[PDB]
Design a protein around this nucleic acid. Structure first.
Ligand code: NA
Ligand code: NA
Length: 314
DNA sequence: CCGACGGCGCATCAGC
DNA sequence: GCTGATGCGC
DNA sequence: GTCGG
C-alpha cells in the first residue's frame, strides 16, 4: 500500500465522483480498472509515463499521476472534495438503494445528510429506508467465522424445507477469504430446469427462524435482503439468494465464486479453445449449451485442470 | 474518429 | 389497468 | 477514460 496507495486512492475517489456525480459509468469503471492494475504493480511508480505502460492507464491518468507525484494532491480532486453539492451527492449514494439519480434529486431539494433522510422518510422507497436503517451495518466487513455460522444456518434451514435442494455460498468466501462484504447463496432443485414457489419456501423458512430480518427485493428467482446471526448483538448483513435451473447451476456457481480476474482469464482461455463461457451456459463457438454436471466439466471442456476456489485469485 | 465497455432481476416510474 | 423504460445493485 | 476496429 505504501508503494502506490496514494495513486490508487486518488483513482478510486475519481471513480466514485464520475459514477455518483457526473453519472459517467464508463469513466467510473475506467478509473477502477486503472486503480486495479496499479494496485498490483510491484514497483513504486516514479512517473505518469511509467504508469502509462500499464493496460488501462492512458494519457489523462498519466497526467494526473504526474501532478500527484509532484504536488502530493490533485487540484480537481481538492476542489471536488470541498464542493458541498458534489460531496453530499457522493455521500448519499453510500445508502443502499440511493444511486446517483436519487442522490442528485435529494440534494436538489436540500436533503443532504442521513439526518435529512431520517426526517424525510416519506420521500424514500422501501429499499432506501432499509439502506438508511442499516447504513452503518452494511459498510461493515463480515469475518469468516461469522460467515461460517451464517452458512451453517442457511444450509440447515434449506435442507429442512426440502432435502433435495442444493445450496452453495459463493463469492470470495468460497475462495477462502478471511472476510466478506455480503453473503451470496446460489440455490437449485431437481424439479427446476431450463426446460421446466421454490425460492419463496426457502426465504419463508429463513424468516421463520428469524435469520432473515428484512427484504429489499424478492421475485421468483432472486431474493435480496438482510440477515442477522442470533446473539448468545451481531450487525445486520446483506444476503442475496439466487434460484438457478439445475442445468445452469454450476456455471452460475463458477461465475459467482470468481474472482473477477479469474473469470476474465477463464473466459479468454475458453475462447482460444473454441468455447464461450458466461454466467449461465458454456457453448461451442455460439451453438447450443453443453451439459454441465459440475464445475470440473467446465474446466474439461476448455482443457484446463480443475482449479480449486482457493486458487482462483487470478 | 468513434463505438464498446457487465447483463439482467426486481421495483418503480413514465406513458398509453 | 397495461407495457416499456429507468434506476439500482451486483 | 481507455482501448481498438
Ligand atoms: Na496504457
Ligand atoms: Na447506493
Amino acid at each position: 500500500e505504501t508503494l502506490n496507495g496514494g495513486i490508487t486512492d486518488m483513482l478510486t475517489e475519481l471513480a466514485n465522483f464520475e459514477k455518483n456525480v457526473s453519472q459517467a459509468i464508463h469513466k467510473y469503471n475506467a478509473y477502477r480498472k486503472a486503480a486495479s492494475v496499479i494496485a498490483k504493480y510491484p514497483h513504486k511508480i516514479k512517473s505518469g509515463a511509467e504508469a502509462k505502460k500499464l493496460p488501462g492507464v492512458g494519457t489523462k491518468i498519466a497526467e494526473k499521476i504526474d501532478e500527484f507525484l509532484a504536488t502530493g494532491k490533485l487540484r480537481k480532486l481538492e476542489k471536488i472534495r470541498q464542493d458541498d453539492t458534489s460531496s453530499s451527492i457522493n455521500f448519499l449514494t453510500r445508502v443502499s438503494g440511493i444511486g446517483p439519480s436519487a442522490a442528485r434529486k435529494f440534494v436538489d431539494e436540500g436533503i443532504k445528510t442521513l439526518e435529512d433522510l431520517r426526517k424525510n422518510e416519506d420521500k424514500l422507497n422501501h429499499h432506501q429506508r432499509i439502506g438508511l436503517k442499516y447504513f452503518g451495518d452494511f459498510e461493515k466487513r463480515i469475518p469468516r467465522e461469522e460467515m461460517l455460522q451464517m452458512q451453517d444456518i442457511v444450509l440447515n434451514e434449506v435442507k429442512k424445507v426440502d432435502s433435495e435442494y442444493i445450496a452453495t455460498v459463493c463469492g470470495s468466501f468460497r475462495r477462502g477469504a478471511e472476510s466478506s462484504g455480503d453473503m451470496d447463496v446460489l440455490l437449485t432443485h431437481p424439479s427446476f430446469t431450463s426446460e421446466s414457489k421454490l425460492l419463496h419456501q426457502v426465504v419463508e423458512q429463513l424468516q421463520k427462524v428469524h435469520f432473515i430480518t428484512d427484504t429489499l427485493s424478492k421475485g421468483e428467482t432472486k431474493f435480496m435482503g438482510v440477515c442477522q446471526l442470533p446473539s448468545k448483538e451481531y450487525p445486520h448483513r446483506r444476503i442475496d439468494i439466487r434460484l438457478i435451473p439445475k442445468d445452469q447451476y454450476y456455471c452460475g456457481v463458477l461465475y459467482f465464486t470468481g474472482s473477477d480476474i479469474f473469470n476474465k482469464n477463464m473466459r479468454a482461455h475458453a475462447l482460444e479453445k473454441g468455447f464461450t463461457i458466461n454466467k449461465y451456459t458454456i457453448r461451442p463457438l455460439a451453438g447450443e449449451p453443453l451439459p454441465v454436471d459440475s464445475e470440473k466439466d467446465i474446466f474439461d471442456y476448455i482443457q484446463w485442470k480443475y482449479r480449486e476456489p482457493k486458487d482462483r485469485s487470478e
